[PDB]
From a paper:
[name], a dual GTPase-activating protein (GAP) for the small GTPases Arf6 and RhoA, plays key roles in regulating a wide range of biological processes, including cancer cell invasion and metastasis. [name] structurally consists of an N-terminal sterile alpha motif (SAM) domain, two catalytic GAP domains, ArfGAP and RhoGAP, a Ras-associating (RA) domain and five pleckstrin homology (PH) domains. PI(3,4,5)P3 binding is essential for [name] function, which drives recruitment of [name] to the plasma membrane to facilitate interaction with its GTPase substrates. [name]-[name] domain adopts a canonical PH domain fold, which consists of a seven-stranded β-barrel that is capped at one end by a long C-terminal α-helix.
To understand how [name]-[name] domain recognizes PI(3,4,5)P3, we determined the crystal structures of unliganded and diC4-PI(3,4,5)P3-bound [name]-[name] domain, which refined to 2.1 and 3.3Å resolution, respectively. The other end of the β-barrel is open and features three loops (β1/β2, β3/β4 and β6/β7), which are hypervariable in both length and sequence in presently known PH domain structures. However, sequence analyses show that [name]-[name] contains a KXnQXR motif in the β1-β2 region, which is identical to the canonical KXn(K/R)XR motif in PIPs binding-PH domains, except for the substitution of (K/R) residue by Gln (Q306) in [name]-[name]. The overall structures of [name]-[name] in free and in complex are almost identical, with an overall Ca RMSD of 0.85 Å. However, a significant structural change upon diC4-PI(3,4,5)P3 binding is observed in the region of β1/β2 loop (S298-V304), which exhibits an outward movement, with a Ca RMSD of 1.52 Å. However, our structure data suggested that residues preceding L290, including P288 and L289, interact with the [name] domain core and may contribute to the structural integrity and stability of the protein.
Residue numbers in the entry: 3 to 101
The structure:
């Protein structure tokens, strides 16, 4: 039962703002990816359950993409190694779910 904990401030692409990056507090506990407007907020602005994620992949310029059946969620980190850590953690959880 993979239960990592990653949390930190990431930039998240907002399509509702005509595709501009907005600061979010993000947390992945192995069951779901939650993003909050602030780490002080009780409730997240959005939640992606692991069961909804079909793929997570890296992209240019320190981005990773969480891809579901109908949607993509694009996050940007401060460094490449940080992006790798989020992407490979998500990939590992998805590999466990898949197997």
């Amino acid at each position: 039962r993979l239960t990592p904990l990653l949390s930190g401030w990431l930039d998240k692409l907002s399509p509702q703002g005509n595709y501009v990056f907005q600061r979010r507090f993000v947390q992945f506990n192995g069951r779901s990816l939650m993003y909050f407007g602030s780490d002080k907020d009780p409730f997240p602005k959005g939640v992606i359950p692991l069961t909804a994620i079909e793929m997570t992949r890296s992209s240019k310029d320190n981005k990773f993409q969480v891809i579901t059946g109908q949607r993509v969620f694009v996050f940007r980190t401060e460094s490449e190694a940080q992006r790798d850590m989020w992407c490979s953690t998500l990939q590992s959880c998805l590999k466990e779910q898949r197997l």
